[PDB]
């Protein structure tokens, strides 16, 4: 049991891992995957290249870390683009609807619902989803305020219609059919 | 004199120690840990003891990079350890260097 790493290499990799926990844990995670490339190894290689190019220790470390962060930013930008594209389809869920699902589960748990009760809940929730109203009115009893409306597919349709109610609003060079 | 034309090619030996030290290692830990003192042969009548407190073995918590996965193989297959923390952070934990 004699490590092949020189003390200089040990200090360098320890400093890199202390500055960034992403580079250290990315290669290993739960168990060392020995057949894949290691980001820490790539960072050390780039640091050595900068050192022989003429950049000293701190500036080389900062530059290589900034390059790694630029790569991670590219990855996250791609992830965000794909996330928007997928969530536009409507079959993908984020936290804003995961909280709704958790609330439904909490409602089912805290008050016990019979099969008839849960079926009625499902039917009424489907009705409110399909034909949900907009600008709900609350009476003073007199005085009514049009606010506090939840999302619905008919609301999506009316906002696609530019809040006009007429599906004919775009007049920019649209092809015709006889 | 004659090396003027030879130096134009300027083919030189490529690094190898750097390549060996930077290629992927089967046993690599995210944080390097200093190995603990191994027991030594104190004498004929004493035997083999460590210098710190007369231990018979080397102080360690985890020696291999995969014992946590071996222990939690069933959980790993079931996917319970997708975001676990105890295995993720304490896989390579080692005892504190307690000596003067």
């Amino acid at each position: 049991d004699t490590s092949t790493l020189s003390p200089e290499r040990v200090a360098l990799r320890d400093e890199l891992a202390r500055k960034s926990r992403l580079v250290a844990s990315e290669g290993m995670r739960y168990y060392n995957i020995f057949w894949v490339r290691k980001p820490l190894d790539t960072m050390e290689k780039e640091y050595y290249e900068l050192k022989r190019r003429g950049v000293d220790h701190g500036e080389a470390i900062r530059k290589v870390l900034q390059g790694f962060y630029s790569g991670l930013a590219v990855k996250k930008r791609v992830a965000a683009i794909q996330a928007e594209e997928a969530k536009l389809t409507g079959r993908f869920i984020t936290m804003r609807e995961a909280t709704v699902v958790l609330g439904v589960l909490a409602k089912l748990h805290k008050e016990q619902l019979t099969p008839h009760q849960v079926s009625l809940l499902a039917k009424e929730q489907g009705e409110t989803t399909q034909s949900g109203a907009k600008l709900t009115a609350i009476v003073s009893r007199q005085v009514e305020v049009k606010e506090t409306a939840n999302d619905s597919v008919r609301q999506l349709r009316e906002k696609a219609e530019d809040q006009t109610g007429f599906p004919d609003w775009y007049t920019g060079e649209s092809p015709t059919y006889s | 004199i004659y090396a003027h034309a030879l130096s134009q090619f300027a083919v030189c030996r490529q690094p190898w120690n750097e390549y060996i030290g930077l290629l992927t290692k089967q046993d690599s830990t995210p944080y390097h840990t200093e190995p603990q003192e191994k027991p030594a042969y104190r004498g004929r009548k004493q035997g083999r003891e460590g210098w710190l407190f007369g231990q018979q073995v080397q102080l360690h918590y985890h020696r291999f990079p995969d014992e946590q996965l071996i222990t939690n193989l069933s959980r790993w297959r079931t996917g319970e350890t997708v975001g676990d923390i105890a295995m993720q952070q304490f896989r390579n934990a080692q005892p504190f260097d307690i000596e003067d």
């Binding site: 020189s6 200089e8 | 030189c12 030996r13 120690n17 390549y19």
Partner: peptide, 29 residues
């Protein structure tokens, strides 16, 4: 010590790298 094992380092030479340019450039001290 004047007796050396098979897997033990010998006495290091005292110098008191500069002279390893002709050898592998990445070879440390």
């Amino acid at each position: 010590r004047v007796a050396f094992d098979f897997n033990d380092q010998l006495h290091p030479t005292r110098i008191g790298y500069a002279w390893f340019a002709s050898q592998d450039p990445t070879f440390g001290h």
